[PDB]
Design a protein around this nucleic acid. Sequence first.
DNA 1: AATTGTGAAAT
DNA 2: ATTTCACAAT
DNA 3: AATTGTGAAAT
DNA 4: ATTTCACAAT
Lengths: 205, 205
Amino acid sequence: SIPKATAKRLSLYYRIFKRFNTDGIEKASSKQIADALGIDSATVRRDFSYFGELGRRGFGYDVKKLMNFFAEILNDHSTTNVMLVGCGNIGRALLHYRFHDRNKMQISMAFDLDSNDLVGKTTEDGIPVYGISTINDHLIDSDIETAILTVPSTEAQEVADILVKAGIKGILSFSPVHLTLPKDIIVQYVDLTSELQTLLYFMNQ
Amino acid sequence: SIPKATAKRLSLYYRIFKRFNTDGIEKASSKQIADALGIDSATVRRDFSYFGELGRRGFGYDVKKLMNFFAEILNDHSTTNVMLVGCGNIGRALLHYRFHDRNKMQISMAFDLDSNDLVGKTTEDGIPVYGISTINDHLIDSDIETAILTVPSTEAQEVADILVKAGIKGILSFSPVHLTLPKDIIVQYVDLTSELQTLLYFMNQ
DNA sequence: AATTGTGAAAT
DNA sequence: ATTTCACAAT
DNA sequence: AATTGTGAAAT
DNA sequence: ATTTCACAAT
Ligand SMILES: NC(=O)c1ccc[n+]([C@@H]2O[C@H](COP(=O)([O-])OP(=O)(O)OC[C@H]3O[C@@H](n4cnc5c(N)ncnc54)[C@H](O)[C@@H]3O)[C@@H](O)[C@H]2O)c1
Ligand SMILES: NC(=O)c1ccc[n+]([C@@H]2O[C@H](COP(=O)([O-])OP(=O)(O)OC[C@H]3O[C@@H](n4cnc5c(N)ncnc54)[C@H](O)[C@@H]3O)[C@@H](O)[C@H]2O)c1
Ligand SMILES: [Mg+2]
Ligand SMILES: [Mg+2]
């Protein structure tokens, strides 16, 4: 919430309260939440307590009340449109994933080089693909200010600048390259090679 | 190294020293490394100092000496064979990524349901795909004890147990589901929806 | 009413 | 900065 | 030889 | 537990 460590769990808590809600479970204790998340229960309680007093003593937490509270925190009572740039290996994995079946996000358009064979067409799921040179045109009346960036590493900086210039305010980047961009622009990195190589480091200790 | 925070950066440092080495840069200061990584230089120095005294005062760090030192720490003077289970959206993104062009890892085989149409064939890059029921057979003389797990969430636990039973010691899992497995088995999670939704949380604060 | 919310300690 | 302990409050 | 390695403080 | 300060050592 305030604390970065807690803010990184919010999405994990929301999923769990949703899963309980689907499974017909109406109450959950912080021990049950801790165990489904693989963390300690004291962190769940300290996490929730930044948002006020959400449980009751001796009972636990009302699953629906918490599912809905977290949806509000996560802005999941409104729809967020995202774009994806770079329709290549990971690009396409994401494009075909129905984010919107579980949360109120969706990739509503994608971009690639103007010469890509997918430009001018749609995804099997109806997501239109356009040339990167037209980004300014399509960004009008999309409500998009968030980009998924899945272009080659050597092009990440150059394409990040195009996105920012064109109005993008937040980037999830799969390139392992620190983007130099103004500090108001939020950048979250996913680094798959580093994740795999770090797994191997832990296995060898 | 000892400290978890530092161990999670090792892979990031290795890449940077490799990149410098490719770019013909022979020396690097902790400020230059900090700036390419987007962190503070005091953490770079404190990070490196867990491994001893790797630089020299007034100079910085010898890029080749550090590239090679990190390759040793990361076990990158030997080849690690990985398997991938679940040849679906993210599965395939990974299968087509040449991990071995940059590090000494490779996905040397994959698995899917026995009825999948890819079973019995190879990847465009020569990676053979087999039925999950044959996992014990193929795990013989592969040197594989690491799995990438990219099956649906509802099947993650059931397939994680098959992998462990069959000899797998480390799992990188893309399912957002805490796997319950013995504590000697190292599990690293990647959670793409939570990463995207957390980006959006940061953008709205 | 069996489990929360939170100071204080530990890391 | 973050986790975990530990217990009076309900 | 301009920058490291590290106690001490801050978080 | 982790980061960042800040400075004597080279
Ligand atoms: N695929 C993986 O599993 C994997 C693994 C580790 C890291 N990564 C990283 O993720 C990034 C992308 O990976 P990938 O394998 O999907 O790469 P890819 O080459 O398969 O996809 C890149 C896409 O971006 C497009 N592109 C290039 N320049 C562009 C531009 N100026 N504007 C718009 N689009 C442009 C390309 O045409 C291509 O479709 C890389 O930084 C890579 O290092 C991917
Ligand atoms: N694709 C994405 O961008 C994305 C985004 C967010 C989360 N995820 C998560 O990653 C996981 C996989 O995603 P996906 O979209 O690639 O799913 P997918 O359904 O596209 O792929 C799953 C694959 O696993 C195979 N499979 C099923 N049971 C199996 C078994 N018992 N043994 C071996 N293989 C089996 C399926 O045949 C299929 O090929 C899910 O947990 C999903 O929530 C993916
Ligand atoms: Mg990489
Ligand atoms: Mg998910």
